[model samples]
Target chain A: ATLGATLQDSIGKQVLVKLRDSHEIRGILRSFDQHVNLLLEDAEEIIDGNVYKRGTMVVRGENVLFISPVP
Target chain B: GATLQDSIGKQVLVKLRDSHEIRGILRSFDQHVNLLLEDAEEIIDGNVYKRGTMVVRGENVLFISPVP
Candidate 1:
């Protein structure tokens, strides 16, 4: 299975999308594409112990480092 | 092409999206930017913590620099 397929299983689940800058976004996985671009809902950026709410987000694929399911 | 082709077979430092750094000998790359690195080691807290080979997804790459 490809990464997209793996991600499909995690839809509706909270996941952590780690970015190139060491920043992270945690949200519900809404959708993804072959390029790994992502659509997340109820997203929030976690940085330096602060949480910044980001409503719906469209993350460019190139900035993605990894997506991990958050329990 | 010049970006990676020129550095083929050379040691390089790869800054990854996760803030994890990788040092390795660049072995190969494709047009998609997929990378194959040998003798690869992961760096954390300024220390070499893991060593092995790895295939890195191109989209996750931040930058590649010839180790100086």
Candidate 2:
């Protein structure tokens, strides 16, 4: 299956997304498009052992390193 | 037992040539250093970015450490 297809299973679930810059975002996956642009709800930025709320966000697909279902 | 043998079933941190740090339960490996890691995550800025299960190529690996 495609990446989008795989992501579809993750909608409404909390996920951790890693960016190319070594930043991480944890949030509920709201939506995504063919480009993998993500709409995340209750988003928080993980940095230096702290998490800062980011609310809803639109993450550009190109910046994504990987996305995994939070366990 | 060798270094790889001693590491089986341990928590290991693998440093990649690309400067990424990968932590996982060392499930398996080979003479060529290919790795099968379980519950793997990429460590970024002290936070974990989960990678889930991973098959890491030997060529990309720099070193592996048995984490406490």
Candidate 3:
């Protein structure tokens, strides 16, 4: 899917991404560059109340595990 | 012995070639034995936004594949 479509599909606020590395990252999506460079607010906690402790990690787009709406 | 019921709700992670991470609820498993992941992340240009996408088939996965 196109970047614009993706953002439009899941716009506003940060989202929860489930990774294959057994870790979870949460952040606010700011924008996407041509190289799929993801820019967002890397929080310190995994808000889901089930993952992470405190201070979220600021991960890049390439290392992304998967993207899903924060549920 | 507990059959373990094949494998569902298992703690599995989907790591892209980039390095970004997303680990969460393993929501679905199709009849074809394919895996469906949810509660993913929106890593802007890194991983983009994905909502419970189909991860193709899982029979040939060679990663640190784990099933619970």
List per-prediction Cα lDDT, in the order shown: 0.76, 0.75, 0.45
Candidate ordering by DockQ (highest first): 1, 3, 2
Candidate 3 lands at a TM-score of 0.36
- lDDT order, best first, reads 1, 2, 3
lDDT of 1 by residue, B1-68 (tens): 45468778988776666577788888998766678999899988868866778898877665455664
Docking class of 1: incorrect
DockQ of each: 0.08, 0.02, 0.03
Q: lDDT tens digits, residues A1-71, model 1?
A: 77667899999998998877776788888887787777677777786889967555556577778999997
The superposed Cα distance between candidate 3 and the true structure at residue B37, in angstroms, equals 35
Writing each residue's lDDT as its tens digit, candidate 2 over A14-66 gives 99988665767798998877766677777777778899675655565655778
Clashing pairs in 1: A20-B17
Q: Higher-DockQ candidate among 1 and 3?
A: 1
TM-score of chain A for candidate 2? Answer: 0.92
Candidate 3 CAPRI grade: incorrect
Model 3 segments beyond 4 Å from truth?
A1-3, A45-57, B1-68
lDDT of 2 by residue, B1-68 (tens): 15457778877766565568898998998755689999899988779898889999875654455664
